[PDB]
Design a protein around this ligand. Structure first.
Ligand SMILES: N[C@@H](CC(=O)O)C(=O)O
Length: 465
């Protein structure tokens, strides 16, 4: 049972949709049980986000109608260029028209009453996948293979009520998909969306189609979950920084998870978790170079003699230093810190706390600084004679995080020392270090201006060897 997922850019145009349809058709020769998961065409979701906001504010029925023609034509052309049989094209066009009719009504709605509930947001956003899936399923039928398009809910992904960033409540993938697969039908499931227990359309957060693939792979006890993207697997680092970056052939579930940082574009660990749990191999493949071997993610670790496997970076960040003697020992300060931050929906990327307990260092994203400062002065006040426990809160802007990653780091005596000497030699100063006890990830913080020289140095010393 192969689960094949395709991103916005993989299905970014009619031509590209047919191309993935071929990829899928070819795989149905090998594995007889294939489920595809598809994302909205590229930039569609972004357009749906923007139009959502621009319907709430500046209510303009005509501006909506213009967007509707844009979405209509992009998809009409997608059908025209992806499917050859006029009979299929007719039937898929009918589905698309039904959807746009709906999308239009809701968008007029949010404009008319000037309200955009998270429920409504989720419904609007979902139209992306609900537009691409019938096209791909049509193309798969055009290539002479049985296929129907399904929604996340219909496929058995039942979620909580947390609109926009919903988590799975329970799975019914087997009940919903096995019957289809029995008739040799290739269901193309809309990634990114789910249904709530009561039936309302839900979204799983941006990049959610990857997660959908993982859950379906999970429910079906799949042999493999194939992520089809626009790069040849996972690279040792971002090629925009180091052009000599190379494809990583094998990756452990844990190594994969540590490469995942909050924001990217990487496969969030949430996606790895189900595969890790059942030991279902993940294969990251390049849609635009389908013969590349890509990246296999498996439990069959082994000890491939190399220590450092990859280098990750995060550039949009800020470093917050929280301090006061007031804070050492059995004080709820730590609990209170992350409470105030939890309230403010402010993500914490790094935490370091040295032996004195007089200090906690955090890295958050640039845009969350004021939100965090305001959250802290809420929980506190910012002298010792006043109740207040925190004495001084410091902010450090224009920084980055670097992570050095590899299972081979575990026993590796001297690796920390070698890493940081290299950092020094590249001209960067090490502002904060965080190495968890798994020893797989050494994360550290430097000025953003030094990011490029540092990665290039680290890459040369530990990857290029
Ligand atoms: N519609 C989804 C596509 C994806 O997850 O790749 C999104 O914009 O996040």
């Amino acid at each position: 049972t192969t689960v094949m997922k395709f991103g916005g850019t993989s299905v970014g145009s009619g031509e590209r949709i047919r191309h993935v349809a071929k990829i899928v058709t070819k795989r149905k020769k090998e594995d007889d049980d294939v489920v595809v998961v598809v994302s909205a065409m590229s930039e569609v979701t972004n357009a749906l986000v923007e139009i959502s906001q621009q319907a709430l504010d500046v209510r303009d029925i005509a501006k909506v109608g213009d967007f509707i023609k844009f979405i209509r034509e992009k998809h009409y052309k997608a059908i025209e260029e992806a499917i050859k049989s006029e009979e299929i094209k007719e039937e898929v066009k009918k589905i698309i028209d039904s959807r746009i009719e709906e999308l239009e009504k809701v968008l007029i709605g949010v404009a008319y009453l000037g309200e955009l509930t998270p429920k409504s947001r989720d419904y609007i956003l979902s139209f992306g996948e609900r537009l691409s899936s019938p096209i791909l399923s049509g193309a798969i039928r055009d290539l002479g293979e049985k296929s129907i398009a399904l929604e996340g809910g219909e496929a058995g992904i039942i979620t909580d009520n947390n609109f926009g960033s919903a988590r799975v409540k329970r799975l019914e993938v087997k009940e919903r998909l096995l019957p289809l697969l029995k008739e040799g039908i290739i269901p193309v499931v809309t990634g990114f969306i789910g249904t709530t227990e009561e039936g309302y359309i839900t979204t799983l957060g941006r990049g959610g189609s990857d997660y959908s693939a993982a859950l379906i792979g999970y429910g079906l006890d799949a042999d493999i979950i194939e992520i089809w993207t626009d790069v040849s697997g996972v690279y040792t680092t971002d090629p925009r920084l180091v052009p000599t970056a190379r494809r990583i052939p094998k990756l452990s579930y844990i190594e994969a998870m540590e490469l995942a940082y909050f924001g990217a574009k990487v496969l969030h660990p949430r996606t790895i978790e189900p595969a890790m749990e059942k030991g279902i191999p993940i294969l990251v493949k390049n849609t635009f170079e389908p013969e590349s071997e890509g990246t296999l993610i498996t439990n069959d670790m082994e000890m491939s003699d190399s220590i450092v496997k990859a280098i990750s970076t995060i550039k949009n960040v800020a470093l917050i230093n929280i301090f006061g003697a007031g804070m050492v020992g059995v004080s709820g300060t730590a609990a209170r810190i992350f409470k105030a931050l939890g309230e403010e929906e402010v993500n914490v990327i790094l935490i370091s706390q040295g032996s004195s307990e007089t200090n906690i260092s955090l890295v958050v994203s640039e845009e969350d600084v004021d939100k965090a400062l305001k959250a802290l002065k809420r929980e506190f006040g910012d002298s010792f004679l006043n109740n207040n426990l925190i004495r001084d809160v410091s902010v450090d802007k224009d920084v980055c995080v670097i992570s050095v990653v590899g299972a081979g780091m575990r026993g590796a005596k001297g690796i920390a020392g070698k890493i940081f000497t290299a950092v020094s030699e590249s001209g960067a100063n090490i502002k904060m270090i965080a190495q968890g006890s798994s020893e797989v990830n050494i994360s550290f913080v430097i000025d953003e201006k030094d990011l490029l020289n540092c990665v290039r140095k680290l890459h040369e010393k530990f990857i290029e060897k």
